[PDB]
């Protein structure tokens with residue numbers, strides 16, 4: 001058992017029935033508050049991506065909002081820029097947008113039309129994968145820009161919600177798996 | 180020239196999200212690794228110089244504040260606490276309503292985010308009217324935290340955000356009218 005993974009796992013805390021009945025909410029806040037834990041999370045993700053893609057990445061894409069907490073740090077670790085995929089209405093200039101559902105509601109994601117040029121290689125990062133709706137919407141938009149999505153990564157994966165399978169055949173990797 | 184790497188990576192869009200606003204887009208700073216690194220480094224060096232070893236935590240403001248908070252905290256060897264838009268955080272919370280340049284909103288913080296006395300520097304991407312950053316200071320004030328300083332990448336000086344935070348020290352890398 002990797003001690004690095006334990007530093008992350010030990011800092012996840014759970015709240016039942018938030019924000020709606022029957023949801024078991026995984027709170028990442030303690031990971032951010034513990035510098036040792038955050039550093040471990042970024043390092044583990046970066047190690048995976050370095051080994052899996054050999055540096056052949058152009059940009060990291062961070063997902064509004066909790067994905068914002070990991071995107072830039074991960075990109076910086078890898079020497080890469082970070083592109084923003086945001087909740088609809090937040091980004092200026094020409095955009096594309098897509099509707100989707102997540103575990104406990106629905107929303108719309110959006111990306112600036114000039115965020116990526118055709119052919120550019122991207123890895124998508126978010127804090128947690130659940131139903132995979134949010135990540136799938138991100139992949140759909142990056143596809144509209146003719147970007148190649150190499151992989152999607154998160155800190156946490158809720159495997160009972162089968163988000164992984166929803167993303168196929170786009171590869172996926174998480175640090176931690178809960179039901 | 181480190182500052183110029185940041186300066187060169189701000190775009191502007193008139194009348195977004197509403198008429199009368201000139202929107203400063205930070206996307207290009209994030210997209211250019213050298214730009215982003217320069218920004219974090221400039222912020223970190225300022226804070227180390229100003230506060231020595233007296234900062235306990237960085238607090239980053241949902242959402243665009245999240246882009247800088249964790250990086251800045253990591254650079255300084257500190258943890259980052261989250262101040263989120265109301266409704267987003269689990270557990271017992273405090274919240275406060277406020278006006279920003281182009282709308283109204285509400286921020287929230289977890290009651291156990293901080294212990295009384297602990298010293299915090301608040302980070303956000305951009306300071307306009309100062310309403311957001313002020314609301315964040317209020318929330319920290321209710322937890323009896325000591326807010327040492329507020330910082331941002333961009334400051335819109337004609338909106339007098341600095342005066343709303345006074346006498347709390349404020350520092351920004353870039354200034355526009």
Ligand SMILES: O=P(O)(O)OC[C@H]1O[C@H](OP(=O)(O)OP(=O)(O)O)[C@H](O)[C@@H]1O
Nearest residue numbers: 064065066102103129130131132133134
């Ligand atoms: O796999 P899914 O079922 O789509 O759920 C996962 C997504 O939902 C949450 O975001 P949320 O919409 O709560 O916004 P936030 O990031 O601002 O918390 C979470 O941060 C993921 O992005």
Ligand SMILES: O=P(O)(O)OC[C@H]1O[C@H](OP(=O)(O)OP(=O)(O)O)[C@H](O)[C@@H]1O
Nearest residue numbers: 241242243279280306307308309310311
């Ligand atoms: O100085 P003020 O007048 O308060 O305005 C500045 C704030 O407004 C913007 O946030 P916004 O509410 O647009 O949400 P976002 O961070 O998700 O873009 C920006 O990110 C600052 O936090």
Ligand SMILES: Nc1ncnc2[nH]cnc12
Nearest residue numbers: 023024025026103128130
């Ligand atoms: N169960 C959960 N916990 C935390 N964030 C989530 N986003 C979607 N589902 C979630």
Ligand SMILES: Nc1ncnc2[nH]cnc12
Nearest residue numbers: 200201202203280305307
């Ligand atoms: N003029 C502006 N540009 C970008 N972000 C902002 N947040 C508040 N006012 C803003």
Ligand SMILES: [Mg+2]
Nearest residue numbers: 064065066067
């Ligand atoms: Mg999210």
Ligand SMILES: [Mg+2]
Nearest residue numbers: 241242243244
């Ligand atoms: Mg903001």
